[PDB]
Amino acid sequence: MKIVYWSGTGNTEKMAELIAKGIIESGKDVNTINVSDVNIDELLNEDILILGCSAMDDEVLEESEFEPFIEEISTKISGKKVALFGSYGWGDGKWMRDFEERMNGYGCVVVETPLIVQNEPDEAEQDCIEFGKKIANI
């Protein structure tokens, strides 16, 4: 499996590692890829796309790297399964409600409720692991 993410301070990166740990604990392999090192072509062969990005600017996806990546794969992911996640700071998940609506609009099937954690995981470490286990059980 593949986990693609953008992280500015490392909070979403930490979530990605924990989600990966959950998938691995389930007996499966998975690679975590920072959005800047991703190969769209190889990524599109996956049955499930696991994508993460923290809330940026004013409740939107990060603009210089993550957003363009989503726009690029948008026309080629209809019917694909996707799981979404990310860290946030002061809002209540508006950027993620929009992200989920968007992916749905492109024809994707969002397999589980998006996992959003405030600031660094810490207390939510198990929740991240469990999210990965749910994905591996699909």
Judged by CB, which is closer to ligand FMN: 112, or 120?
Answer: 120
Of 79, 83, 78, 77, nearest in space to 135 by CA: 83
Minimum CB distance to ligand FMN smaller for 1 or for 7:
7
Return d(Cα 60, Cα 64) in angstroms, integer.
12
What is the Cα–Cα distance from 98 to 122, expressed in whole angstroms? 25
**Residue placing its CB nearer to ligand FMN in the complex, 22 or 54:** 54
Closest contact distance (angstroms) between CB of 138 and ligand FMN is 24
Nearest distance from C-beta of residue 86 to ligand FMN, angstroms:
7
- Shortest CB 7 distance to ligand FMN, Å: 4
* Element spanning 128, H or E: helix 125-136
Residues lying near ligand FMN in the complex (CB under 6 A): 7-12, 54-59, 87-91, 119
Query: Is the Cβ of residue 42 or residue 101 nearer to ligand FMN in the bound state?
Result: 101
Residue number with CB closer to ligand FMN (89 or 107): 89
Contacts of 82 (CB under 8 A, 6+ apart): 48, 49, 50, 51, 103, 108, 109, 110, 111
Q: CA geometry: angle at 47 spanning 7 and 65, to 5°? A: 25
Instruction: Compute the distance between CA of residue 11 and CA of residue 87 in angstroms, rounded to an integer.
Output: 6
